[PDB]
Design a binder for this molecule. Sequence first.
Ligand SMILES: COC1=C(OC)C(=O)C(C/C=C(\C)CC/C=C(\C)CC/C=C(\C)CC/C=C(\C)CC/C=C(/C)CC/C=C(/C)CC/C=C(\C)CC/C=C(\C)CC/C=C(\C)CCC=C(C)C)=C(C)C1=O
Ligand SMILES: NC(=O)C1=CN([C@@H]2O[C@H](COP(=O)(O)OP(=O)(O)OC[C@H]3O[C@@H](n4cnc5c(N)ncnc54)[C@H](OP(=O)(O)O)[C@@H]3O)[C@@H](O)[C@H]2O)C=CC1
Ligand code: SF4
Ligand code: SF4
Ligand code: SF4
Lengths: 176, 45, 155, 145, 318, 342
Amino acid sequence: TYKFVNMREPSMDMKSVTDRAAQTLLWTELVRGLGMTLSYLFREPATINYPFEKGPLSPRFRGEHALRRYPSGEERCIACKLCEAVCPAQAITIEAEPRADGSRRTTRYDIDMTKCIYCGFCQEACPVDAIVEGPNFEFSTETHEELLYNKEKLLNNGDKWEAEIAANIQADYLYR
Amino acid sequence: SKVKQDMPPPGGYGPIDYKRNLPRRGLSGYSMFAVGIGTLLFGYW
Amino acid sequence: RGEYVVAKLDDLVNWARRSSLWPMTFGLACCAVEMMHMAAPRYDMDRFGVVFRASPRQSDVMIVAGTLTNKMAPALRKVYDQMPEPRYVVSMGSCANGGGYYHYSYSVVRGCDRIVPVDIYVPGCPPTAEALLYGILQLQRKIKREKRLRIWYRR
Amino acid sequence: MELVQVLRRGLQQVSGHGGLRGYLRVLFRANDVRVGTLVGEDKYGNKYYEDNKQFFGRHRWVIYTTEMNGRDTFWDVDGSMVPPEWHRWLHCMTDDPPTTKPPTARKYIWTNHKFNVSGTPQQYVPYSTTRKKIQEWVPPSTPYK
Amino acid sequence: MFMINILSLIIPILLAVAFLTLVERKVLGYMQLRKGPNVVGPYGLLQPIADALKLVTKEPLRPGTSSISMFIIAPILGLSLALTMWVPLPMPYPLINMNLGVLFMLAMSSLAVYSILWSGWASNSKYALIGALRAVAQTISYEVTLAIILLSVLLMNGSYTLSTLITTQEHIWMIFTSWPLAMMWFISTLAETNRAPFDLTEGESELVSGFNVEYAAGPFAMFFMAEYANIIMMNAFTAILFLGASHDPHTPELYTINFVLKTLALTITFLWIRASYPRFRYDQLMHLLWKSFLPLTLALCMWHISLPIMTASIPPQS
Amino acid sequence: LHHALIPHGKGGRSSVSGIVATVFGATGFLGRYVVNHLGRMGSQVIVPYRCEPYDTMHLRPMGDLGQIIFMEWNGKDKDSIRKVVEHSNVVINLVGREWETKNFDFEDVFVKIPHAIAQVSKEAGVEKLIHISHLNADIKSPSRYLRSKAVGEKEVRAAFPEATIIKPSDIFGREDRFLNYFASMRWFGGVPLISLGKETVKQPVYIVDVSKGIINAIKDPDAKGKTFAFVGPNRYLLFDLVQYIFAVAYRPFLPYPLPHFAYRWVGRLFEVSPFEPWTTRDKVERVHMSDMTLPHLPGLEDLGIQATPLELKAIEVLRRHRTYRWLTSEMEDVKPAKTVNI
Ligand SMILES: COC1=C(OC)C(=O)C(C/C=C(\C)CC/C=C(\C)CC/C=C(\C)CC/C=C(\C)CC/C=C(/C)CC/C=C(/C)CC/C=C(\C)CC/C=C(\C)CC/C=C(\C)CCC=C(C)C)=C(C)C1=O
Ligand SMILES: NC(=O)C1=CN([C@@H]2O[C@H](COP(=O)(O)OP(=O)(O)OC[C@H]3O[C@@H](n4cnc5c(N)ncnc54)[C@H](OP(=O)(O)O)[C@@H]3O)[C@@H](O)[C@H]2O)C=CC1
Ligand code: SF4
Ligand code: SF4
Ligand code: SF4
C-alpha cells in the first residue's frame, strides 16, 4: 500500500481560480501562519524552573558511578573484574590483593569518568550489585583531574547516595 | 502468583488519529474582494 | 574607600558577564543534541540569559559538545583564537572531556583540553540537558567569583 | 468574571508568601511566585513544595536554604543542594516523600549531604590507591671497604 | 532647553531600543512555547542593561585585514542616522517641523545602507562582502517601491509635511483609503529595516552573521542600536501614515498615548512575523518586487494620481 | 633520586622526567615558554600565581593532566613561598616588572622577592635555583631596574651559593615589549631615537633560545653556582635595529633626535598613567644603554644551544604590526640590518 503525497491537480472553476487569486493577492495562508503562532503564544509555556524544578527521571537512570556495600558494612565488591572485563571503553582499572582478614577486595578500583560512556554494562555484569550507576548527574568539575575517580571517591559516592541507590534498586531489581 | 507486565488494557487502547486535520476556514474569494473594494469605496467617499 | 569602589565595579562587571553569557553554535556530535534540548522549551537557555550566537567574534563560552578529532582540532583551536576575551570553554561529554568511547582511536584528540584551556568539564555520554545546564550555572558562579579589578588594585 | 478572579488570586500570591516582603524574596530568589502545599523540609533548610495541579514537570519544587555547610546560598544555588533522600521525590522518580516513606538507615550513610565540592579547597584530587611494587636495596651503613 | 528636547529624543529612544531586545526575546520565546529571559531581576527587566554592560566591556578586536577608518566610521554613520531620522516625526508636535519631512526621511533611510556597505567592505571577509552585495540588491529593489508608495499615499495628504497627516486622517484612518499600498508598504518596512523574512544581509543560517561577522563588542552593539532604532522608527512612520489618531490641541498627551500604542502594536507584528515564516532566498525577494510589487504599485500610483481629480478631492497644500 | 623521580618514557607529555619545578612569575613571556618546555618533557610544574586564575588559563594546556598545579602566593609572605617550594627539585625565579607599581617598587620585585625565594628554597631543601637577571646589570646604572637587579643577584648568590644565575640580554618574541615596543612607537608621530640612536649597540636573544637554555641548565649537572649570560649571535646598532624592525613591519620610519631630559619628561608623563605604563624613565633609559659584552661569563653555546639570528625569527613578531598591504610578504624580502662585528 502506497499513497501519492503530492498528486493533487487544482480545480479550474471560476470560483476556484478566484479563491487562488484572492489567496495570492490577499495573503491568506500567511494569515493562517500568523494565527497559529498567535494561538501558541496565548498557550502555556513548557519551561521548568531549574534548578528549583527538575525534569522527571526514572529509577533506571544512569549517572555517577558508585560502589555500594552490604548492610553490615563490608563492601560488596570482591574484585571478580567482570565490570573491568565488560566495560566497552576500558574505563575501569582494578588491582586486587587478599586483605588482612582474608577476603579478596580491590587494592585499587579506579573508574575514569572522562572515558566512561555511562552504558551501565558494569552494573549488569556485577554479580553482587557492588558497582552501580547512581542517580546523580550534577557532578560537573572545573578541572579534568577531578573526573578521574579513585576507590575512595567511589566509596564516598556509595556512602552518600546509598539512600537513593538502595531505593532505586529496590524498585527495579525485579525487572532485571 | 500470576505474571505481571506492562500490557494494553483488556479492551485495547482507544483510536489514535493520524490523518491530516488541516481545517478549512475563511470567506470566499468573491467575498474577500468585495469587502476590500467596499472598504476602499467608503474610505474614498 | 578605593577597595569598596573596585569591589562594586567587580560585582557589576562580573554580573554582566555571567548574566549575558553568549554561547557558540559549535555542536559536533550527539552531545550537540542535548545542547539543543536545553535550548528546547523544557529547559530554555534563554531565561538564564544565554542565547546561541554563531560567528565567534560575538560569543563568550564555547561548549565543545562531541568528539574532537585530529582533522577538526586545528579548526577548533583557530576558532577559539577568534574569540575576543574574556572567553570560556565548557567541555560537554566524555569524548570532548578525555576521549570517551574512542579514546584509543588513531584520529581522536584525547581530550579537548589538549587544544584549548577548558574551563568547565561537563561529564556524560551524553550529559543530560539538566547536567549541561548545571555546568553552565557552575561557569556562571565561576564568573561571579572573579576578582579582576581587585587584583588590579593590588597590582 | 474570570478577569476579576484572575486579578484576585494574584493577591493570594502575595498573601501566601508571608506578605509582600516574602513575595519579593521568592520572586528575586526562585524567580516564581506560585504557591504550593509544604510537602516537607530537610535538615539543611530547603523547603519542598508540591502542587499536583501543575503540569508534569513543575508539580514539585524546592526553595533552597539560605545557608548550607558554611556557605551563603541566599543568592547562589545549585541542583546539588538536594539531599539524597529527597532527590528521588523531587525528580519524580517516586511518589513517596521522605516524610511519609523514609529511606532505610544504615551506619555508613552520611549525615551531612555535601554539595558539589568543585572549586572550593575541599576538591577531590585523584591519586594511586595502591602501594609500591618494586622495593629498593637500602644499602648498608657500615663503611667496611 | 532645545538641548533638553534633543536629549529627551535620544535617551528615551535608546532605552526603548534596549527594551525592544527584551520584548523580542520574550514575545518570540512565547511563540515557541518557551519563556524568554526570566532570571535577571523581575521578568528579565535587567537583561538589556546586562548585555549592554557586557558589549561595552568586552574586547573590541580589530581584524588584521580591516580598513580601520571605514570599519570605525560605519557604526557612527548607522547610529547617527538611526537617531537623526527620529527628529521629524510628528509626535504630537514634531521636534523639527520640516516642510519636506518625508523626503528627508527617505534620504536618510537611503543613506543608512552606506553604513552596511562600508562595514561589509572594510571588514575584508568573504561572508561580509556577500552580505554587503545582498544588502545592495535588497535596498535598491525595495527603495523603488518605497518611493512610489510614499508618493501614492501622500497624494491625498497635499504635501510632504508629516504634521498634516494628522489633519488628513481627522475623520478616518488612511488605511481605509489605501489598504493595498499599505500592505506593500508594510512589506517594504520589513525589508528596508533588513528584518525577517528579508533578513538576508545577516543570514544567520547561511552567512553566519553577514556584515556583523567581524563586528564585536561595542561596534556590534552599535549596529544593533541602529537596526532596532530603525525598526521602531519605521513602525512609528507606518503608524503616522496610515493608522492616524485623534489629536486634541489642548492635551497632546492623548495623541502621544495613541501613537505610542500604535507603534507598539506595529512592532509587535514585526516580531510576530519574524517568528512565523521561513526566510526568503535572495533573488526571490527581488523577483517578488520587480515582478509583483512594482507593477501593482505603479497601477496604484496612476489610480491615486487620478482619484482626487475624478472626485474633486484634491487636498490643499497649506 | 626518589622512586618517582627516576626518568621514564621518551620525553613526551606522559613521561616521568624528574624535573619537578616551581616557576615564580610563570604568567608572562618566558614564564609561559619555560613551562611549555617543562610541560613538553613531562615534568610536574608547581606554577604559583597571584593574578586572576583566568589569566592562568593559557598555562593549563601545556602539561599532561595532573602535571601542572596552580597555587596562590604572595611576594611578601614567606609561608606562601614555603608552601609552593616545599616539594620541588628546582625553583626558577622569573619574577619581574618593567615598571614600579604602587605596592611594589623595583627593589621589591628584584631584591626583596628574590631574597625571599632564595632563602625559602634553601630552607626547604631544593637542589637547584635558577635566578634570572639582566645582562646590563650594574650597581651604578642610572636605571633603578638594573641596579636593583645587581643587588638582587648579589643577595641571591649569598643566600643560595649554588644558584644558577642567568643574565639574558634582551628577549624578543611574540610578546616581548622590545620589538613590539618599537613597532608600537609608530602611533606617537615618528620614532624619537636619543641622539638618533647611533651610539647604542643592542644584542637581542631569541625567547626560545633563553627558555631552552633554562631547560638545559636544569638538565646540566654543572650549571650549579655558575653565572651564564644569554645573548644573541649578532650585535646590532640601535638605529639599524629600528630600521630592520620598521622594514619587516613595512611601516614608515621617521627618526627624530630627542634631548635626553625631554625624553625623561615624556617617560614621566607616560608613567602618570594608572594602567600599563607604555613607557617609563627606566624604559627610555634602558633602550639607550649598550649591551655590556662579558666574554668571561659562560654563554648559551656552552649549554649546547645555537643562538637564532633575529632575522629568521623577526617575521613572527612583526607580522601582526603590518597593515593589510604588506601582510603576506615573505621573510627574505627585507635584507638583514648591518651588524657591528663582535
Ligand atoms: C543535523 O545535525 C546537526 C548537528 O549535528 C551534530 C549540529 O551540531 C548542528 C549545530 C548545532 C547547533 C547550531 C546548536 C543548536 C542551536 C540552536 C537550537 C539555537 C538556539 C537559539 C536560541 C535559543 C536563541 C535564539 C535567539 C532569539 C530568539 C532572539 C535573539 C535576539 C536578541 C536581540 C539577542 C540579544 C542581543 C543583543 C545584542 C541585544 C542586547 C543589547 C542591548 C540591549 C544594548 C543596550 C544599550 C544601551 C541601553 C545603551 C544606553 C545608552 C545611553 C542611555 C546613553 C549612551 C551615551 C553615552 C555618551 C555613553 C546542527 C545545526 C545540526 O543540524
Ligand atoms: N627583555 C626582558 O624582558 C628581559 C627580562 N628578564 C627578566 O625575566 C623575568 C621575566 O620577564 P618577563 O616574563 O618578560 O616579564 P613579565 O612582566 O611579562 O612577567 C613578569 C612575571 O612576574 C610576576 N610578578 C611581577 N611582580 C610580581 C609581584 N610583586 N608578585 C608576584 N608576581 C609578580 C608577573 O605576575 P603578573 O603576570 O600577574 O603581573 C609575571 O608572572 C623578569 O625578572 C625580567 O626582569 C631578563 C632579561 C631580559
Ligand atoms: S557504566 Fe561507565 S563504568 Fe560501567 S561499563 Fe559503562 S562506561 Fe564503564
Ligand atoms: S563486577 Fe562488581 S564485584 Fe566484580 S570487580 Fe567489578 S565492582 Fe567488584
Ligand atoms: S561523550 Fe558520548 S555522547 Fe558525547 S560525543 Fe562522545 S560518545 Fe557521543
